[PDB]
């Protein structure tokens, strides 16, 4: 048997944390895990690896939980045992050093950026104005500082920074406006073809040079930092960058849909032409209406019209109602992105659809229609 | 603020050691769970003064007075807990659904250490029985 001892005071600096399989593996790797919080008395505490984020929660319970450790007695522990039964001789001693009335639970969470003193850049030069007419006075200068004050991991943060089009100007972190981001892409693309650059292997220096070599600097907002931002948004690097041509085509197509087929429909091949015309000349891409799945519907099979998902009814039977009203027969994957959000009980997505829709075979192909 | 979890000490001891079964963790720790309150006296110093060597209820370890409150007998997986003179509780050695890290939070430095990782507990859910 084991002799059980207790101290007169427990130490509450000892606490229990759930180690999910992934966290467990890291803890046995062989300082890769980090606790973080915006402040000391207010905000959530998160736990971060290089690559992932967990949130901490605590849950009190009603039982006694003693944490006990083996100890070596200074003197042998002698006492009269008075009964036999079901109790072998002591062979070791343990002492309760902590008593916990709760667990800290660890749950996977989406890392996010803390964007508070960070301005939008639209951006004329003499950005000093927007810098000094801001929220704080304090400047967030570096991405590292931004990350340090964020509820997310290094890699989650960098990835979001690239996806929202983060940049820096005059030593001040900023975020590019949708308009300027798009405009900056357009100018970078124009210039890259004009100088016969390798769009699979771009770098900041050559691309920066290509953009500004015939522009007077004091009127050139496309700094190296801006060029890097645009590459990290619309390209993939590795150390050079590779342009994401389909992503870029879609980006233009969505604008086209908004401009030409917002309240109105248009023949698909005639729309393609107008979509194609927004590109800078000679831009190598073959455009296809299926790149705009989730952003359009087809009132007839040879017409197209724009749709914003956000306008749709929230109840899924209502959503399916409105879509079939707009278009009787849907190719299966045209309609999937417009209804996935409502699939809350994580059904397999094609089961979710057959709950509200019917499959119908025409020629060879399979379409979907209302039940 | 931010701080890393130091698991350095734990990783070397997990190599200088060997065994789990359950028994105890290799580092010498265990988790005891009871459906109830453990009632120990409010004043150890007073009762320790008065302590027979027949009872053997109090001892000094590293500057602390420890009360000897019970005995634990493992036979399965099955476990029996004797508490004080008059109680027997029947319980179970359970493998944890989610292993539990014991972390020590040193407030002076705002630093945190991995003390051990608990994978088993011994738990007692049922009404105490009379002795034997």
């Amino acid at each position: 048997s084991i002799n059980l001892h207790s101290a007169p005071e427990y130490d509450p600096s000892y606490k229990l944390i759930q180690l999910t399989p992934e966290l467990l593996d890291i803890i046995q790797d062989p300082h890769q895990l980090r606790f973080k919080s915006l402040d000391k008395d207010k905000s959530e505490v998160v736990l971060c690896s290089h690559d992932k984020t967990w949130v901490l929660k605590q849950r009190k319970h009603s039982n006694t939980v003693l944490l006990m450790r083996e100890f070596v007695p200074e003197q042998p522990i002698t006492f009269d045992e008075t009964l036999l039964f079901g109790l072998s001789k002591p062979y070791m001693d343990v002492v309760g050093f902590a008593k916990t009335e709760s667990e800290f639970e660890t749950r996977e969470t989406h890392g996010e950026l803390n964007l508070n003193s960070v301005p939008i850049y639209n951006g004329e030069l003499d950005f000093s104005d927007k810098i000094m007419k801001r929220s704080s006075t304090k400047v967030i200068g570096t991405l590292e500082e931004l990350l340090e004050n964020s509820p997310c991991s290094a890699l989650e943060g960098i990835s979001k920074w690239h996806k929202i089009g983060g940049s820096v100007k005059d030593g001040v972190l900023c975020i590019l406006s949708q308009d300027f981001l798009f405009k900056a892409l357009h100018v970078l693309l124009m210039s890259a073809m004009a100088e016969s650059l390798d769009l699979q292997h771009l770098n900041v220096e050559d691309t920066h040079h290509a953009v500004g070599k015939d522009i007077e600097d004091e009127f050139n907002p496309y700094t190296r930092e801006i060029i890097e931002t645009v590459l990290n948004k619309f390209a993939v690097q590795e150390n050079t960058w590779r342009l994401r041509i389909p992503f870029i085509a879609q980006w233009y197509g969505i604008q086209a849909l908004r401009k030409y087929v917002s309240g109105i429909s248009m023949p698909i091949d005639e729309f393609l032409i107008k979509w194609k015309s927004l590109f800078p000349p000679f831009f190598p891409c073959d455009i296809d209406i299926d790149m705009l799945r989730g952003y359009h519907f087809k009132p007839t099979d040879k017409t197209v019209q724009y749709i914003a998902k956000s306008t749709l009814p929230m109840d899924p039977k209502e959503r399916f109602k409105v879509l079939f009203r707009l278009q009787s027969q849907w190719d299966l994957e045209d309609i999937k992105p417009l209804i996935e959000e409502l699939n809350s009980r994580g059904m397999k997505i094609d089961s979710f659809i057959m709950k509200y829709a019917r499959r119908k075979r025409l020629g060879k192909k399979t379409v979907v229609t209302s039940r | 603020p931010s701080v890393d979890i130091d698991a350095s000490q734990w990783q070397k001891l997990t190599q200088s050691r060997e065994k789990q079964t359950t028994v105890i963790t290799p580092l010498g720790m265990m988790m005891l769970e009871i459906q109830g309150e453990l009632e120990l006296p409010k004043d150890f110093a007073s009762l320790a003064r008065r302590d027979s060597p027949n009872e053997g209820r109090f001892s000094e370890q590293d500057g602390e007075t420890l009360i000897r409150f019970g005995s634990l007998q493992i036979d399965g997986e099955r476990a029996t807990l004797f508490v004080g003179k008059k109680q027997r509780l029947l319980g179970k050695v359970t493998k944890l659904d989610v292993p539990m890290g014991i972390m020590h939070f040193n407030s002076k430095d705002n630093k945190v250490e991995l003390v051990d990782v608990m994978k088993y507990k011994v738990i007692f859910k049922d009404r105490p029985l009379p002795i034997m």
Partner: peptide, 27 residues
């Protein structure tokens, strides 16, 4: 007259609602 030690049994078990954690709740 000497030391009395026992478990006061709980008839069952309560797990409370989970709560947020502050930096200070850890230190």
């Amino acid at each position: 007259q000497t030391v009395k030690i026992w478990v006061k049994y709980n008839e069952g078990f309560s797990n409370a609602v989970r709560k947020n954690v502050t930096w200070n709740n850890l230190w």
